Design a protein around this nucleic acid. Structure first.
Length: 832
RNA sequence: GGGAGUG
DNA sequence: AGCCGTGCGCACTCCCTAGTGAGTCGTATTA
DNA sequence: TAATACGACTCACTTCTGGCGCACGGCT
């Protein structure tokens, strides 16, 4: 790729794009990729006419003088110098002003190490993408029917000027700050446009150095980087360059790693099944669900919206101002801190909502849209764009597949199943799910008739997703069983984590509680735990502990006993929802203290916010108690999965350990990275390294030494603690990751399935192919756990490696159970 | 160190 | 070498949060 | 060498909203 000209590198993407899909979409794709950038430059001109013609000349002059000064001096030249000679001084000036203005308008602070960092990154990207960007820009800024356009370009036909690409910045974070600081240093002289005001001098936690915009300029005044594709994304051929098309931006890495080196371990691997899966998933043609968008645009604007999620809409002021004495000052301060919190959460959720709608409106009339795909350092498959089929209810509802397949009876059956799933009817046998739909035939049809008048769908678990089903259900009733349908029908695994642990150890048990075994009733592991919790809960209600006073120093507080806390939970009702996240995360190496944090966030806090949590007098103490109850009750429901994790924790603990000898500092063995290969051939290295902080020593404006503490990008020592606490979740996540990828391949190759809706452990396709997918997920899982033992394979990877006097601390290995893997094929409620 | 979302 | 104090709560992704400068010294760099 | 920059180490200047136990860095 480095062998091509900049002229060539800017023309090739356009040309190959204009040949396969026409020049119309070829321009839009590039404009969309550079729109980020385009707006960055536009926001700069705002802000231009409505003193700028005086700042730029002054800055350019200072830069040139500074170079003359540095060149005349002897000894080590400033760090920022050589990096600032990569770009024409005129442009160096422009960027500094542009970036500094962007940092101060949107953000109300702003820290120096943030601005300096922002300028630094803006320089490097200009250095290596500036010219190619300018040249590529020419294509869409000129002036000013389709198919076969949803066909993917052949990999062997891709020009070499599209294959490679450096996805990682070569610049160090330290080096990047140096550049920004010295650019700010030259921006204060000349002009000075911004001032450097020191804040909270003396406080260990609050002391900082912030850039302030001068009063003269102040009174004179989400994120479009990753958007959907209008054309099918570029096939992944190697570690970089897949997904998007533009050459003036910076390519995507196939695997999202913590360093360039970690990605380089994939350069020459040969993992055909992995590339194949991503490419097929990537190639899925989506479109905006116009009908759902028509509703979402109107209802989210209402002051009292029928859906329980949609946030204000209204700033919602602080209450309320009562006398100023002892406990009247409490007060209040608790209710205020609650509102400040509510509002913050509400604002971020609103911004998100606004964005998802803006996206859906843009692509509302596009024949088809696409989403480039990536993977995290483990297997898991991620959509690169911000607007995703992997988002929440509304975002998912607004999306739908582009190409349909005929269509009825078989498809219509699972169409009603999906509808039932969208509503709070997913823990019930299929014939009864159908019965729920058929009973509410008048509740449906009428919601497709006038959704703005009928808000019954809003009351369902997935409001917009259920609404998308209703519009599609009404279509069948009016057109027939030949009615073209393209809604993605999602088949989600019960408890993914515990499903894989059950399968890899052939736990009966186990099975079973997570629906791997054929049963007439839907097994709810979350309901089973809660049931056991309620028995412990009732036990403490009649005979438990009374309230104490720990008096820690007013200052004295009341510690509630087991009796009082139990009464508070029975007054709320501890259902499956309270245990949901707590049951899953255990199968990812979690602890008791960890549960407290979950129960508080997922159950307690929103109850207080909803006005249904007035029972929780001491909220954190109630969260601790419930965490204690789950830890106990769940413990005897997932025994084998726990030993499985403990076997993995030990393995990783011992590998990450540094050797020791009898007084001698003999380095018999260093700390090791945990490595294993997933069934479809994807390799994963676990290298959690210790976060370290370094400090820079900058003689700022010849007055003082600006010494910013920064989070080092340079690697250090392997974090042994994280290696142990992260091995269990990351192993199964890579494990369910491959199962997902193998599913896509097996569904695409043996069956004619082309469209996929993938959310890690949920599998969605068009109604016609649903039957095959429902069957494909089982086959691909049964096949993986029959063919190879992942724990044995992992063992074959790290020992060797083990030392000695280490293998006596190493178990186990978890005994195999009596589960028959073939039974999964006959399982009805093991969607995944 | 927070905020949001997914499993 | 052993003691006592402070840090951290299962992952992954995306969005608003890297204590401070001065004193002193060693060191890698360049006319 | 002589001069320059800077890193590396040391030292001192709306809410407390929690809990419990274990591991590691910082200190002497």
């Amino acid at each position: 790729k480095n062998d091509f000209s900049d002229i060539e590198l800017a023309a090739i993407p356009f040309n190959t794009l204009a040949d396969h899909y026409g020049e119309r979409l070829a321009r839009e794709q590039l404009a969309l990729e550079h729109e980020s950038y385009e707006m960055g430059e536009a926001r700069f001109r705002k802000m231009f006419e409505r003193l700028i013609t005086t700042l730029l000349p002054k800055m350019i002059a200072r830069i040139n003088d500074w170079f003359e000064e540095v060149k005349a001096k002897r000894g080590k030249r400033p760090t920022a110098f050589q990096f600032l000679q990569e770009i024409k001084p005129e442009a160096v000036a422009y960027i500094t002003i542009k970036t500094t203005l962007a940092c101060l308008t949107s953000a109300d602070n702003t820290t120096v190490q943030a601005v300096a960092s922002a300028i630094g990154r803006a320089i490097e990207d200009e250095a290596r993408f500036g010219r190619i960007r300018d040249l590529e820009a020419k294509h869409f800024k000129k002036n000013v029917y389709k198919k076969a356009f949803m066909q993917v370009v052949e990999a062997d036909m891709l020009s070499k000027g599209l294959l490679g690409g450096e996805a990682w910045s070569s610049w160090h974070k330290e080096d990047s700050i140096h550049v920004g600081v010295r650019c700010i240093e030259m921006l204060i002289e000349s002009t000075g446009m911004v001032s450097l005001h020191r804040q909270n001098a003396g406080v260990v936690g609050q002391d900082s150095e912030t850039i302030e915009l001068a009063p003269e300029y102040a009174e004179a005044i989400i994120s479009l980087m990753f958007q959907p594709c209008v054309v099918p994304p570029k096939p992944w051929t190697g570690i970089t360059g897949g997904g998007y098309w533009a050459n003036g931006r910076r390519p995507l890495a196939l695997v999202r790693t913590h360093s360039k080196k970690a990605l380089m371990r994939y350069e020459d691997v040969y993992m055909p099944e992995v590339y194949k899966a991503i490419n097929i998933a990537q190639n899925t043609a989506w479109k905006i669900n116009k009908k759902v968008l028509a509703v979402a645009n109107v209802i989210t604007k209402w002051k009292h919206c029928p859906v329980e999620d949609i946030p204000a809409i209204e700033r919602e002021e602080l209450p309320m101002k009562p006398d100023m004495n002892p406990e009247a000052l409490t007060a209040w301060k608790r209710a205020a801190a609650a509102v400040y919190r509510k509002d913050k959460a509400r604002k971020s959720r609103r911004i998100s909502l606004e964005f998802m709608l803006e996206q859906a409106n843009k692509f509302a009339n596009h024949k088809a849209i696409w989403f480039p795909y990536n993977m995290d350092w483990r297997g898991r498959v991620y959509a690169v764009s911000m607007f995703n089929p992997q988002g929440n209810d509304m975002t998912k509802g607004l999306l739908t597949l582009a190409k349909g397949k005929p269509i009825g009876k078989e498809g219509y059956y699972w169409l009603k199943i999906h509808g039932a799933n969208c509503a709070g009817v997913d823990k019930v046998p299929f014939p009864e799910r159908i019965k729920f739909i058929e009973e509410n035939h008048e509740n449906i049809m009428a919601c497709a008739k006038s959704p703005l008048e009928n808000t019954w769908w809003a009351e369902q678990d997935s409001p917009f997703c259920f609404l998308a089903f209703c519009f599609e259900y009404a279509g069948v009733q009016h057109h027939g069983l030949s009615y073209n349908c393209s809604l993605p029908l999602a088949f989600d695994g019960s408890c993914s984590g515990i499903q894989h642990f059950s399968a890899m150890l052939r736990d009966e048990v186990g099975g079973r509680a997570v629906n791997l075994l054929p049963s007439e009733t839907v097994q709810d592991i979350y309901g089973i735990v809660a049931k056991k919790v309620n028995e412990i809960l009732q036990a403490d209600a009649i005979n438990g502990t009374d309230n104490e006073v720990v008096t820690v120093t007013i200052s004295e507080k009341v510690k509630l006993g087991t009796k009082a806390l139990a009464g508070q939970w029975l007054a709320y009702g501890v259902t499956r929802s309270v245990t949901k996240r707590s049951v899953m995360t255990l199968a990812y190496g979690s602890k008791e203290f960890g549960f407290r944090q979950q129960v508080l966030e997922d159950t307690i806090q929103p109850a207080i916010d909803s006005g249904k949590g007035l029972m929780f007098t001491q909220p954190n103490q109630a969260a601790g108690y419930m965490a204690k109850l789950i830890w106990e009750s769940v413990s005897v429901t997932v025994v084998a999965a726990v030993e499985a994790m403990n076997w993995l924790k030990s393995a990783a603990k011992l590998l990450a350990a540094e050797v020791k000898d009898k007084k001698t500092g003999e380095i018999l063995r260093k700390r090791c990275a945990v490595h294993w290969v997933t069934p479809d051939g994807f390799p994963v290295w676990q290298e959690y390294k210790k976060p370290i902080q370094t400090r820079l020593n900058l003689m700022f404006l010849g007055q003082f030494r600006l010494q910013p503490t920064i989070n080092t990008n340079k690697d250090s020592e392997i974090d042994a603690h994280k290696q142990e606490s992260g091995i269990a979740p990351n192993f199964v996540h890579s494990q369910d990751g491959s199962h997902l990828r193998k599913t896509v391949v097996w569904a695409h190759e043996k069956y004619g399935i082309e469209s996929f809706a993938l959310i890690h452990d949920s599998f969605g396709t068009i109604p016609a192919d649903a039957a095959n997918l429902f069957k494909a997920v089982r086959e691909t899982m049964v096949d993986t756990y029959e063919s190879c033992d992942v724990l044995a394979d992992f063992y074959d990877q790290f020992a060797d490696q083990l030392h000695e006097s280490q293998l006596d601390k190493m178990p186990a290995l978890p005994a195999k159970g009596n589960l028959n893997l073939r039974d999964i094929l006959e399982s009805d409620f093991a969607f995944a």
